[PDB]
A paper describes a structure:
Cellular Src kinase (c-Src) is one of the most representative members of the Src-family kinases (SFKs), a group of non­receptor tyrosine kinases that mediate responses to extracellular stimuli, phosphorylating a broad range of downstream substrates. Although v-Src shares 95% sequence identity with c-Src, this kinase shows uncontrollable activity that is responsible for the occurrence of sarcoma in chickens. A number of these mutations are located in the SH3 domain, which plays a critical role in enzyme function by facilitating the interaction with partner proteins and providing the formation of the closed inactive conformation of the kinase.
In this way, in order to stabilize the domain and to be able to crystallize the protein, we introduced a Gln128Arg mutation in the distal loop (v-Src SH3 Q128R; c-Src SH3 R95W-T96I-D117N-L124V-Q128R). The v-Src SH3 Q128R mutant was stable enough to allow biophysical studies and to be crystallized. The type of β-turn in the RT loop is also different from that found in v-Src SH3 N117D-V124L. In this case, residues Ile96–Asp99 form a type IV β-turn with a hydrogen bond between Ile96 N and the Asp99 side chain. Besides the RT loop mutations, the v-Src SH3 Q128R variant also bears oncogenic mutations in the n-Src and distal loops at Asn117 and Val124. In c-Src SH3 the amino-terminal region is usually disordered, but in v-Src SH3 Q128R residues Gly81–Leu89 form an extended β1 strand. In addition to the low solvent content, in v-Src SH3 Q128R a PEG molecule and a sulfate ion facilitate the packing between protein molecules in the crystal.
Numbering used by the authors: 81 to 140
Write the structure that this text describes.
């Protein structure tokens, strides 16, 4: 629901077109949701926005 800043725990490479790539340690602003583990995220590093798998991140 809200926005929180998360940190990536592992590298991740976009491969479903709508997902966002990131590197371990990268900070992501994320809107969590309860429908599943794909969350809409925004990289403060790259400026890009897209879905991430929530098991790859943790709150900062």
């Amino acid at each position: 629901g809200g926005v929180t800043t998360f940190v990536a725990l592992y590298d991740y490479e976009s491969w479903i077109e709508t997902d966002l790539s990131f590197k371990k340690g990268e900070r992501l602003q994320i809107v969590n949701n309860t429908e599943g583990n794909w969350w809409l995220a925004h990289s403060v590093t790259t400026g890009r926005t897209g879905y991430i798998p929530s098991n790859y991140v943790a709150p900062s």
